[PDB]
Antibody, heavy 211, light 213 residues
Framework: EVMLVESGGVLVKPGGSLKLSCAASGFTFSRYAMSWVRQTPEKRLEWVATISSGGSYSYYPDSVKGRFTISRDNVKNTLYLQMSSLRSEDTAMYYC?????????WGQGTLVTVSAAKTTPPSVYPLAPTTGSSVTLGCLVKGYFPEPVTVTWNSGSLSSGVHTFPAVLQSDLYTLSSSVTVPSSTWPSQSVTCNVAHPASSTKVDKKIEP | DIQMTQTTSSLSASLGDRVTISCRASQDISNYLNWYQQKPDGTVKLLIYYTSRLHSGVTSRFSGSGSGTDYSLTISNLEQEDIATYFCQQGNTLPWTFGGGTKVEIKRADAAPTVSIFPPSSEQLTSGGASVVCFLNNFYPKDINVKWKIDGSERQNGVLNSWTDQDSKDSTYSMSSTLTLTKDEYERHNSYTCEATHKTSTSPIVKSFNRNE
């Protein structure tokens, strides 16, 4: 199967530089032009760059021309985007795509956050509860920066009945929460814990929901 | 630069409906018009290129038509997996440009929110903060109002609200509301109430706790 996987999206200060990568597999990479497309937090898409199949010709819109450079390695089958003189409005999810008909295939995206705000790990608090057949528990993930965090329950063993809410930024810190609903006969007789990972701070914490 | 406009930014349709999403280019783009689907989780795929060509692997329920400035994506019969935002994109003249998207909502029968309230954790209190959380889960339609009341008075400062996208399996929405106070503020009051208004109940749906219990 055709696959593209972006990497390198992290927090960068205004004026800074960052190099994104895109690993291609499942097709003859050197036969296709390749592109980067970005999406703002407001969900607008913007084409960023294209490079010809052989790597010789590039194209950029004026929004990034002179600051971004697309390149490729047709032996390792990798696409790159070197960014410089970054501005907060460059904050976006960056996607790599193959040119064929349209942007024919896309990766999962890598998030670039251009901000002066400081990296901060989350504080993770349990939400514990008056009974019924089902009981709802949760985990409050407060005061972190930047996105993303990932939340699981019982190390991923508990996936049914889970709602993880989109993070909301206020005063340069994000907060999110996650709820999980289980049979009342399962809790507290059986443990429920939330697992919270924040790559930027290299943290992975577990929080047991104690009655 | 060519500007692509999807005049409808969101639509609501029922399972089985034939759905039409429209796109207008600011000038004739000679059939160089592509359509993408972005799922709530961010996954993007090409659906249709060159106006009408179905991309490999895509369900044949999707089709595309048009010419000149006016183009349409059609879904032959709407299915559960179609919750997504659909974007048009012109490939006629650089820079390549996208429409602003049309989000598709599945119109399901009403569903009442299940409301849960949570006092601050002892851990957070010991650290001097006090967040009270209220989940409103699995409701439809999306329209809902939430009030926090402290000793019976409404409180608006310090509230953080977040909504899930429409659920891929049951077509409901959920909401989280967090009221963050200082420990000192929290300790001045007894009754904490999260009160929702939704079309499924003629009265407010209330969950509450008292600090003195």
């Amino acid at each position: 199967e055709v696959m593209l996987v972006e990497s390198g999206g992290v927090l960068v200060k205004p004026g800074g530089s960052l190099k994104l990568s895109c690993a291609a597999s499942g097709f003859t990479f050197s036969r296709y032009a390749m592109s980067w497309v970005r999406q703002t937090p407001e969900k607008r898409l913007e084409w960023v760059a294209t490079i010809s199949s052989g790597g010789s010709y590039s194209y950029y819109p004026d929004s990034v021309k002179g600051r971004f450079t697309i390149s490729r390695d047709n032996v390792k089958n990798t696409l790159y985007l070197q960014m410089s003189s970054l501005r907060s409005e460059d904050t976006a999810m960056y996607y790599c795509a193959r040119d064929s008909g349209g942007f024919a295939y896309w990766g999962q995206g890598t998030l670039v956050t251009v901000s002066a705000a400081k990296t901060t790990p989350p504080s993770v608090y349990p939400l514990a509860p008056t009974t019924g057949s089902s009981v709802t528990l949760g985990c409050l993930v407060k005061g972190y920066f930047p996105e993303p965090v990932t939340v699981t329950w019982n190390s991923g063993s508990l996936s049914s009945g889970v709602h993880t809410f989109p993070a909301v930024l206020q005063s340069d810190l994000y907060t999110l929460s996650s709820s999980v609903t289980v049979p009342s006969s399962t809790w507290p007789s059986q443990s429920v814990t939330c697992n919270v990972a924040h790559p930027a701070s290299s943290t992975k914490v577990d929080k047991k929901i104690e009655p | 630069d060519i500007q692509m406009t999807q005049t409808t930014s969101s639509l609501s349709a029922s399972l089985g409906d034939r759905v039409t999403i429209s796109c207008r280019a600011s000038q004739d783009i000679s059939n160089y018009l592509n359509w993408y689907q972005q799922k709530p989780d961010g996954t993007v795929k090409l659906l249709i290129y060159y106006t009408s060509r179905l991309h490999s692997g895509v369900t044949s329920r999707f089709s595309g038509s048009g010419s000149g400035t006016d183009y349409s994506l059609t879904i032959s019969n709407l299915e559960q997996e179609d919750i997504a935002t659909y974007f048009c994109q012109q490939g006629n003249t650089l820079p390549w440009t996208f429409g602003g998207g049309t989000k598709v909502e599945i119109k399901r029968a009403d569903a009442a929110p299940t409301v849960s309230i949570f006092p601050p954790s002892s851990e957070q209190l010991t650290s001097g903060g006090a967040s009270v959380v209220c989940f409103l889960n699995n409701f439809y339609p999306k329209d809902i109002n939430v009030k926090w009341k402290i000793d019976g008075s409404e409180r608006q400062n310090g509230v953080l609200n977040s909504w899930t996208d429409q659920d891929s399996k049951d077509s409901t929405y959920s909401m989280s509301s967090t009221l963050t106070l200082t420990k000192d503020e929290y300790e001045r009051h007894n009754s904490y109430t999260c009160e929702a208004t939704h079309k499924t109940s003629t009265s407010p749906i209330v969950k509450s706790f008292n600090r003195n219990e």
